[PDB]
């Protein structure tokens with residue numbers, strides 16, 4: 589584990605992370621997809637061998653010795669708000685189990701279900717709060733990756749509020 593486990597946020601491509609493993613915002617079928625998923629596919633294509641897994645779960649596949657944790661958040665266009673909230677919290681709990689099992693000291697993570705799976709709604713607070721609930725009991729350094737300047741400021745403020 590990390591000496592003083594922390595949360596940090598960076599506004600950059602998660603495929604260029606400086607952490608010991610990455611969480612992919614995956615689709616259930618292990619397809620290359622779009623957004624974070626396509627960048628992850630271009631950087632670690634070997635990690636997509638048998639990576640298909642149900643919504644609400646996470647499945648790790650090694651690219652060399654680098655772990656790619658494929659986490660499948662719900663698509664809010666298909667799920668109700670209630671059932672979608674439950675699957676989003678579950679996907680993060682499965683990421684925490686995988687990070688612990690791997691024994692890594694750090695992990696790069698995106699905000700699940702905030703892009704094309706958002707159902708057209710701003711889900712920054714909802715997704716980030718489920719991320720904290722799952723990762724707070726782990727001792728890995730967590731680095732959250734985003735692409736928007738206003739989202740970087742809001743995520744940074746949410747982390748600082750707790751310290």
Ligand SMILES: CCn1nc(C(=O)N(C)Cc2nccs2)ccc1=O
Nearest residue numbers: 702703706708709710711735736739
């Ligand atoms: C543009 C800032 N930003 N917005 C979202 C967002 O809110 N999504 C995609 C859902 C929406 N679609 C229309 C309106 S709200 C996700 C990440 C991000 O950085």
Ligand SMILES: [Cl-]
Nearest residue numbers: 599600601604
């Ligand atoms: Cl970048």
Ligand SMILES: [Cl-]
Nearest residue numbers: 702703704705
């Ligand atoms: Cl998404």
Ligand SMILES: [Cl-]
Nearest residue numbers: 734735736739
């Ligand atoms: Cl973003």
